[model samples]
Target: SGKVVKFSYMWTINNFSFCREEMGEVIKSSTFSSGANDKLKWCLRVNPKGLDEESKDYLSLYLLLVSCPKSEVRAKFKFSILNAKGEETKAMESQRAYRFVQGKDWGFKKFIRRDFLLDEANGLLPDDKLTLFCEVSVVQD
Candidate 1:
């Protein structure tokens, strides 16, 4: 027999800029869960490239923000970025308590990555530029 469990998941990116333009609704997710670990995971995919062939010198910037309920136990947060070839490019790890005081929610974690450098080596076309994929993992014990 297996135990049943439920978990709520949410994600958002505030003030995200791509190609020097503000992108609306850059982050989103649905509900997910685990049976025993009570863990939730999500993946975010983005491509930062210019719209036209002549626009080759464009750059995109992203800001990541997260919120969660307060938990007594310590939680682990981990994230990573992958390139188009499925190779790890950058990663971050943090251990902190998701505390809510006086009706305040969890603190927002900010992550920024510039996309102008990725296009320099991959040619002029936007499709030639490397794709970006981000993954987040939350663990509670």
Candidate 2:
């Protein structure tokens, strides 16, 4: 059987919800370089199962990229894993307080990657589905 893998991310422009609102524009602007306002991007990959195959382990990888004309922006990233029963497990978080300097046309960026192992000792049924959630915040400059 093929192992199941899922990926997701959140991006923002000047504290605006780019991923939820204007995803295409964010993607297009991030792909290349354009002289535009500073932007923040965050992404994550999660596996319901963790490192141990028999333990029903899961993994999550998150990335954040920022582009600005002047300086870098400080940001925080968080993630969580949930099971079919709506139970949450393996929560992780990262935070930055100070402002980050910008380089070149892009200003500042932050990336976070995380992994989790589900406790399968209780036994997981085939019908069970895992859920992953990602949260991000950009501090004011």
lDDT of 2 by residue, 13-121 (tens): 2311112322111222233221223233323332222223332322323333444434565555466544446554456666454354443122112221212122345
Taking the tens digit of each residue's C-alpha lDDT, what string does model 1 give over 1-141? 342232323233332333343232123333334334433222232323432333334322222222223332233343444444555555454555342222232212333234534444532223443333333333332
RMSD of 1: 9.1
In candidate 2, which residue ranges exceed 4 Å CA deviation? 1-39, 45-60, 66-70, 95-119, 122-129
- Candidate 1 residue runs with Cα over 4 Å from true position: 1-26, 35-73, 95-110, 116-141
Highest lDDT: which candidate?
2
CA lDDT of each prediction against the hidden true structure = 0.34, 0.35
Clashing pairs in 1: none
